[PDB]
């Protein structure tokens with residue numbers, strides 16, 4: 001929609017921001033987009049694909065969800081609330097760490113999973129395995145979020161990531177049970193109350209994973225169900241001159257622009 005494009009460009013101009021958006025249907029067909037194939041830093045949005053990789057290994061038997069991953073204080077990095085709470089106990093299970101990574105964006109738990117799957121190269125291999133030739137993880141937390149201008153490390157594009165989301169949730173990447181679990185984790189996410197879902201109607205089923213990077217990166221990827229119609233969505237923004245609250249409001253505004261499009265396309 002032309003209103004969709006114009007409204008996003010008005011936000012970009014007035015907030016000195018770039019907004020990358022892709023909305024795809026369950027089969028990956030494009031519904032709408034803006035700067036869809038511009039690369040943006042993934043920031044913590046990769047933790048959703050990371051959990052998907054873990055569930056695939058659980059599905060295949062190469063990982064077990066209740067396996068205990070032991071660690072010491074060396075695994076604590078900034079914003080590791082669950083990892084800090086479980087530190088005295090000495091471990092988190094595979095599933096606990098994945099849920100912490102998805103629902104709290106726990107950075108220590110993310111690095112703990114990376115230790116167990118083979119590091120950033122293994123995450124990138126999983127993207128390639130499910131047909132995403134674009135998304136790439138080059139580093140662990142926190143440095144993967146440095147978001148140095150122009151750096152192609154640790155990037156994706158809105159369209160590639162939206163199609164990856166659709167493959168994971170609708171395209172058979174996971175068993176029905178693992179798909180349902182990761183869906184519920186996304187709905188129950190604790191970090192997205194002020195971002196995309198704040199801009200969507202309150203009767204839409206929404207689940208998503210946020211990201212924040214230095215140099216003004218603020219992202220939110222996931223899915224929404226509007227009545228019976230399911231969509232996958234990826235939103236990446238760069239707004240160096242906005243405050244953190246204003247960046248939250250920007251993503252929520254993008255959610256409203258998406259909503260106007262979806263409501264009118266009926």
Ligand SMILES: *C(=O)/C=C/N[C@@H](C(=O)O)[C@](C)(Cn1cc[n+](C)n1)S(=O)O
Nearest residue numbers: 043044078079107142145210211212213
């Ligand atoms: C996912 O997007 C992870 C984000 N990490 C950021 C952030 O939350 O903005 C960190 C935690 C930056 N930060 C904020 C406060 N402190 C002490 N560090 S970091 O891992 O870059």
